[PDB]
Amino acid sequence: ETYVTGGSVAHSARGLTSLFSMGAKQKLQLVNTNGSWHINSTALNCNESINTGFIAGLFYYHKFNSTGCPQRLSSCKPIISFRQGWGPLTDANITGPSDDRPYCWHYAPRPCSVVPASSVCGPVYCFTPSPVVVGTTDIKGKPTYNWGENETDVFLLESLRPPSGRWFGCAWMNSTGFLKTCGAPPCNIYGGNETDLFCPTDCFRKHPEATYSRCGAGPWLTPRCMVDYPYRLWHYPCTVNFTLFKVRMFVGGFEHRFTAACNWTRGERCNIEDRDRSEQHPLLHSTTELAILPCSFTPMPALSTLGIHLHQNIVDVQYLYGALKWEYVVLLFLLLADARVCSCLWMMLLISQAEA
Amino acid sequence: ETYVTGGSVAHSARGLTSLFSMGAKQKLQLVNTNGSWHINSTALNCNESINTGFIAGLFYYHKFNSTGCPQRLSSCKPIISFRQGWGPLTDANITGPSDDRPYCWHYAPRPCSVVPASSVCGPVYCFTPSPVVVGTTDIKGKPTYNWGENETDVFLLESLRPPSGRWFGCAWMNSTGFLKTCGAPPCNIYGGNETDLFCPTDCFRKHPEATYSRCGAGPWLTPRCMVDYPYRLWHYPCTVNFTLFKVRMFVGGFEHRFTAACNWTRGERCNIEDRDRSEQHPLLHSTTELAILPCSFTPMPALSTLGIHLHQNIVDVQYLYGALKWEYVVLLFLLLADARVCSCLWMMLLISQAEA
Ligand SMILES: *[C@@H]1O[C@H](CO)[C@@H](O[C@@H]2O[C@H](CO)[C@@H](O[C@@H]3O[C@H](CO)[C@@H](O)[C@H](O)[C@@H]3O)[C@H](O)[C@H]2NC(C)=O)[C@H](O)[C@H]1NC(C)=O
Ligand SMILES: *[C@@H]1O[C@H](CO)[C@@H](O[C@@H]2O[C@H](CO)[C@@H](O[C@@H]3O[C@H](CO)[C@@H](O)[C@H](O)[C@@H]3O)[C@H](O)[C@H]2NC(C)=O)[C@H](O)[C@H]1NC(C)=O
Numbered sequence: 001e002t003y004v005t006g007g008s009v010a011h012s013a014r015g016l017t018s019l020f021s022m023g024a025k026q027k028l029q030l031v032n033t034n035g036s037w038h039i040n041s042t043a044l045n046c047n048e049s050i051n052t053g054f055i056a057g058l059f060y061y062h063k064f065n066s067t068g069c070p071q072r073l074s075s076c077k078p079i080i081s082f083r084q085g086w087g088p089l090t091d092a093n094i095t096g097p098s099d100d101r102p103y104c105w106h107y108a109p110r111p112c113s114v115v116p117a118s119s120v121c122g123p124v125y126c127f128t129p130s131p132v133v134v135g136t137t138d139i140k141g142k143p144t145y146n147w148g149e150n151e152t153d154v155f156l157l158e159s160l161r162p163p164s165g166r167w168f169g170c171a172w173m174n175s176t177g178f179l180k181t182c183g184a185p186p187c188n189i190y191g192g193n194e195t196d197l198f199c200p201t202d203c204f205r206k207h208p209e210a211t212y213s214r215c216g217a218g219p220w221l222t223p224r225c226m227v228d229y230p231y232r233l234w235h236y237p238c239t240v241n242f243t244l245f246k247v248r249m250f251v252g253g254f255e256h257r258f259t260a261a262c263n264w265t266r267g268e269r270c271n272i273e274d275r276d277r278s279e280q281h282p283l284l285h286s287t288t289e290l291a292i293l294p295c296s297f298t299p300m301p302a303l304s305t306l307g308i309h310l311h312q313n314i315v316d317v318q319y320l321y322g323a324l325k326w327e328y329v330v331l332l333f334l335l336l337a338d339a340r341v342c343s344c345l346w347m348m349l350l351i352s353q354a355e356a
Numbered sequence: 357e358t359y360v361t362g363g364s365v366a367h368s369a370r371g372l373t374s375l376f377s378m379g380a381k382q383k384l385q386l387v388n389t390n391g392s393w394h395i396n397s398t399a400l401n402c403n404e405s406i407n408t409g410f411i412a413g414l415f416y417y418h419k420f421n422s423t424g425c426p427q428r429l430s431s432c433k434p435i436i437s438f439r440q441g442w443g444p445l446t447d448a449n450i451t452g453p454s455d456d457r458p459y460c461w462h463y464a465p466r467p468c469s470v471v472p473a474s475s476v477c478g479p480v481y482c483f484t485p486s487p488v489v490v491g492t493t494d495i496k497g498k499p500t501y502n503w504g505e506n507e508t509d510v511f512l513l514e515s516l517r518p519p520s521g522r523w524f525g526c527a528w529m530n531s532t533g534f535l536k537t538c539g540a541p542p543c544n545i546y547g548g549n550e551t552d553l554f555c556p557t558d559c560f561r562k563h564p565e566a567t568y569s570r571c572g573a574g575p576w577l578t579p580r581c582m583v584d585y586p587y588r589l590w591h592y593p594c595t596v597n598f599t600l601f602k603v604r605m606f607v608g609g610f611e612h613r614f615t616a617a618c619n620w621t622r623g624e625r626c627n628i629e630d631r632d633r634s635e636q637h638p639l640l641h642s643t644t645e646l647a648i649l650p651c652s653f654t655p656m657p658a659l660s661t662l663g664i665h666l667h668q669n670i671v672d673v674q675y676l677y678g679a680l681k682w683e684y685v686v687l688l689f690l691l692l693a694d695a696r697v698c699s700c701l702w703m704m705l706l707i708s709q710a711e712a
């Protein structure tokens with residue numbers, strides 16, 4: 001039976017919180033719009049503070065009328081559906097209309113340019129692996145000079161890859177409540193019935209070295225897991241059901257720690273092919289057990305030896321705790337032979353190779 | 357007394373190797389040239405194979421006539437000599453003549469462009485943290501079109517930062533016998549008697565977040581240490597006295613392991629200010645002892661707590677092996693009070709914060 005150990009779930013992180021007792025009055029529910037399913041932005045208070053939004057997200061665990069969520073998610077595809085990849089990576093060129101629904105894990109965004117705050121509701125979140133909030137500054141002052149009309153305090157992101165730039169990608173909702181995100185260019189894996197995946201994240205199974213650091217640009221680490229943040233339920237509705245995990249990234253030399261949610265349910269077939277690469281780092285750095293994303297692994301070989309050791313029935317666990325007898329025997333035989341010159345040569349060879 | 361433990365030295369990695377008995381006949385020594393000190397390219401066989409050059413480097417431990425080395429090194433400067441840095445990084449733009457001697461650790465190179473092989477001797481080495489050799493391919497065929505005249509098989513590097521590109525920087529020695537190197541653009545740390553350091557490496561002490569991954573482009577990790585490779589003496593002569601160490605980088609998500617040498621002698625004052633940031637990772641991943649670069653550290657905090665623990669006398673060591681009694685006592689007092697609602701609230705708070 002496939003299950004987890006360290007999986008923390010926030011579906012009922014509440015008790016006797018009936019002081020509000022009803023959605024804290026900012027009802028969050030999906031509606032259809034000419035065959036399109038987004039959040040009902042009408043009631044959906046917009047100009048709140050960070051603490052008010054934090055309380056609102058705190059009270060949202062149960063009242064989710066997830067009715068149209070399946071048919072909305074029908075647009076998304078599993079990683080299997082795409083075609084193979086090969087060759088050296090290239091940087092894609094996202095242009096023209098993007099008919100794809102952005103909430104899918106594999107949505108290629110446009111480069112993060114300027115954006116007027118007159119058409120955004122809620123905070124805007126950039127996703128240097130540890131999520132961050134982005135503020136504003138008045139457009140009327142700077143020569144940015146009126147992308148719209150009498151607007152003020154436009155957001156600007158304009159970031160390169162986080163090792164050089166500031167963040168991978170950022171997300172928000174526009175005024176009508178539709179998800180809108182941008183990010184760094186993703187990886188094309190073909191230039192050098194199915195569809196060509198543009199790999200906005202760690203598409204390990206479809207391309208070997210397309211790691212998150214090189215390719216990923218956005219909230220998605222694996223096609224199964226994502227980085228959590230206070231407005232995660234805000235921006236992405238359907239991912240309510242997810243379970244949290246502890247993550248240590250270590251991107252760009254610096255250290256990054258945060259939480260991650262996942263498309264995980266007990267009993268999912270996860271034999272060997274449903275494993276995705278993700279660069280983790282030890283949290284406690286001991287006990288030889290690593291809490292890793294479910295249906296995943298990390299490229300850190302074990303202590304004594306190499307070869308990733310993973311448990312059949314629990315996927316979140318990464319195992320550790322899985323010598324030159326020949327050379328020592330040869331050296332001892334040489335010593336018995338008393339060939340000191342040969343003994344000295346063997347000692348030098350061991351120092352160069354065995355000892356080094 | 358300041359000394360090391362894991363420091364391996366290859367100054368006498370030899371014994372009874374007198375078959376050649378003289379430098380394998382390609383005697384290597386420095387000479388002056390109009391006030392400039394480069395290698396004796398005259399004798400200096402050029403068209404050797406990898407194995408022949410490897411044997412040559414194997415036999416080069418003792419016959420190094422270190423006469424002009426000090427006055428040649430007089431051009432280099434210690435990290436103290438430069439000025440402070442601040443603000444967000446920028447990418448510098450190296451143009452025009454570069455009068456600085458490239459062998460200094462702090463030499464800013466030009467972008468790695470094409471280069472005709474008719475003016476290079478020996479292998480060319482690109483320094484993706486684990487050093488690699490670069491081959492050639494005929495210039496006459498492709499759209500390169502004859503940089504010189506009737507030349508063939510020119511080198512091309514044209515790489516971005518290794519997370520996106522292929523290597524940080526590459527080096528070689530040009531036909532007349534002078535070091536020639538290129539690399540990714542370095543970090544300017546001021547745009548956003550002493551001189552302005554352009555930071556081609558991990559200039560941690562002069563700029564806090566100028567890590568190697570963001571800034572470094574070339575063989576130098578620290579102003580004290582440098583990644584080793586077979587033709588290290590071939591390119592940099594004066595660095596013979598260096599001592600080797602093991603290094604685990606973890607660059608761009610992938611894993612890198614190689615050897616590093618350092619400007620280290622016993623007795624160097626290394627109290628607290630002579631420590632340079634460098635990202636290592638555990639080799640054996642146990643025993644709580646890390647063999648790191650001397651006079652350095654690593655942003656990988658200890659197991660139980662944080663705070664880099666470093667021994668006063670031996671520098672190569674990084675120490676590991678340096679709880680909510682308050683909350684537990686509060687919860688237990690609440691339980692004794694039998695305030696179940698308060699007890700439930702405390703349990704939820706602990707789950708949200710203490711347990712998470
Ligand atoms: C979390 O994981 C579950 C499990 O994969 C996801 O449910 C899956 O959603 C897809 C998309 O609609 C379903 O595929 C579709 O099935 C219909 C009906 O067979 C078919 O007509 C479509 O062509 C498409 O193949 C899939 O059946 C469904 N699987 C299960 C077990 O429910 C869910 O969407 C994921 N949610 C998130 C937020 O990641
Ligand atoms: C918030 O984002 C949504 C998602 O894109 C926006 O909806 C889209 O809005 C554009 C223009 O506002 C619509 O384009 C117009 O519609 C026709 C329909 O064929 C299209 O062909 C033309 O290009 C025309 O310009 C687009 O259809 C519409 N799509 C959906 C699914 O609603 C919405 O306008 C954004 N609102 C704000 C305030 O930013």
Ligand SMILES: *[C@@H]1O[C@H](CO)[C@@H](O[C@@H]2O[C@H](CO)[C@@H](O[C@@H]3O[C@H](CO)[C@@H](O)[C@H](O)[C@@H]3O)[C@H](O)[C@H]2NC(C)=O)[C@H](O)[C@H]1NC(C)=O
Nearest residue numbers: 011062063064065066067068069070237238239240241242
């Ligand atoms: C996240 O997990 C919860 C826990 O089960 C899911 O809630 C359950 O979802 C199913 C699917 O719609 C509900 O079944 C339907 O219920 C309605 C109303 O009772 C009924 O009219 C339908 O015929 C069908 O039986 C189920 O009631 C519901 N249970 C609870 C306690 O909410 C939830 O659906 C999961 N998230 C997503 C996006 O699926």
Ligand SMILES: *[C@@H]1O[C@H](CO)[C@@H](O[C@@H]2O[C@H](CO)[C@@H](O[C@@H]3O[C@H](CO)[C@@H](O)[C@H](O)[C@@H]3O)[C@H](O)[C@H]2NC(C)=O)[C@H](O)[C@H]1NC(C)=O
Nearest residue numbers: 426427428429430431432433434580594595596618619620
């Ligand atoms: C390895 O480390 C040693 C120790 O720093 C380096 O030796 C140092 O080299 C510099 C450069 O010439 C010397 O500074 C110069 O000193 C002269 C004489 O005082 C002065 O006139 C110059 O203006 C300049 O300040 C420094 O004294 C010298 N220190 C020692 C202890 O020898 C050596 O160059 C390093 N080698 C490599 C390959 O890294």
Ligand SMILES: *[C@@H]1O[C@H](CO)[C@@H](O[C@@H]2O[C@H](CO)[C@@H](O[C@@H]3O[C@H](CO)[C@@H](O)[C@H](O)[C@@H]3O)[C@H](O)[C@H]2NC(C)=O)[C@H](O)[C@H]1NC(C)=O
Nearest residue numbers: 389390391392393474475476529530531532533534535536
């Ligand atoms: C191999 O690399 C060395 C190191 O740069 C080259 O030596 C340099 O060569 C240039 C032109 O060949 C010399 O520039 C010339 O010298 C005067 C001196 O005032 C300079 O003002 C002019 O710009 C003139 O072009 C440069 O002085 C010289 N420097 C040294 C230290 O030797 C060498 O030419 C390269 N060899 C090949 C075959 O590419």
Ligand SMILES: *[C@@H]1O[C@H](CO)[C@@H](O[C@@H]2O[C@H](CO)[C@@H](O[C@@H]3O[C@H](CO)[C@@H](O)[C@H](O)[C@@H]3O)[C@H](O)[C@H]2NC(C)=O)[C@H](O)[C@H]1NC(C)=O
Nearest residue numbers: 367418420421422423424425426429593594595596597598
């Ligand atoms: C690497 O370490 C070796 C070991 O000490 C250094 O070799 C020594 O270098 C000193 C400095 O030049 C030599 O002293 C000089 O020796 C010459 C010839 O004997 C003498 O005429 C001078 O008056 C002065 O005393 C010393 O002899 C030499 N020892 C050996 C065994 O080679 C070497 O210099 C170091 N590397 C560098 C680049 O400095």
Ligand SMILES: *[C@@H]1O[C@H](CO)[C@@H](O[C@@H]2O[C@H](CO)[C@@H](O)[C@H](O)[C@H]2NC(C)=O)[C@H](O)[C@H]1NC(C)=O
Nearest residue numbers: 028029030031032062063064065066067068069
């Ligand atoms: C969840 O939202 C759906 C949206 O369709 C609700 O379905 C509608 O419910 C009303 C009354 O409850 C009916 O008059 C409509 O005909 C329903 N729509 C359809 C398409 O059948 C559903 O009731 C909501 N459920 C909850 C628990 O809020």
Ligand SMILES: *[C@@H]1O[C@H](CO)[C@@H](O[C@@H]2O[C@H](CO)[C@@H](O)[C@H](O)[C@H]2NC(C)=O)[C@H](O)[C@H]1NC(C)=O
Nearest residue numbers: 080205268269270271272273274275310311312
């Ligand atoms: C482990 O070995 C098996 C056979 O020993 C390999 O092939 C799998 O065999 C099972 C048994 O029928 C199939 O259900 C799987 O579909 C096979 N794998 C594939 C990729 O087709 C395989 O080397 C290993 N098993 C798996 C599941 O990969």
Ligand SMILES: *[C@@H]1O[C@H](CO)[C@@H](O[C@@H]2O[C@H](CO)[C@@H](O)[C@H](O)[C@H]2NC(C)=O)[C@H](O)[C@H]1NC(C)=O
Nearest residue numbers: 381382383384385387395396397398399400401
């Ligand atoms: C180092 O370079 C010098 C050039 O100044 C070489 O000196 C000449 O080398 C040639 C070739 O062996 C001889 O024919 C000349 O007689 C040498 N002249 C002098 C004044 O030395 C020297 O041989 C080189 N050393 C090497 C290659 O080991």
Ligand SMILES: *[C@@H]1O[C@H](CO)[C@@H](O[C@@H]2O[C@H](CO)[C@@H](O)[C@H](O)[C@H]2NC(C)=O)[C@H](O)[C@H]1NC(C)=O
Nearest residue numbers: 384385386387388418419420421422423424425
């Ligand atoms: C190391 O190189 C220096 C070159 O400066 C050699 O010193 C020269 O020796 C010659 C004769 O042997 C004389 O012209 C001078 O004594 C030096 N020339 C200078 C200083 O310009 C030195 O002999 C070499 N060492 C060894 C061991 O060969």
Ligand SMILES: *[C@@H]1O[C@H](CO)[C@@H](O[C@@H]2O[C@H](CO)[C@@H](O)[C@H](O)[C@H]2NC(C)=O)[C@H](O)[C@H]1NC(C)=O
Nearest residue numbers: 436561624625626627628629630631666667668
């Ligand atoms: C260790 O603490 C000392 C004082 O408690 C700090 O200042 C150093 O004090 C010594 C004693 O005279 C001086 O020699 C050093 O020059 C002082 N440091 C500096 C940077 O000037 C300091 O926090 C620590 N020591 C050092 C060398 O940094």
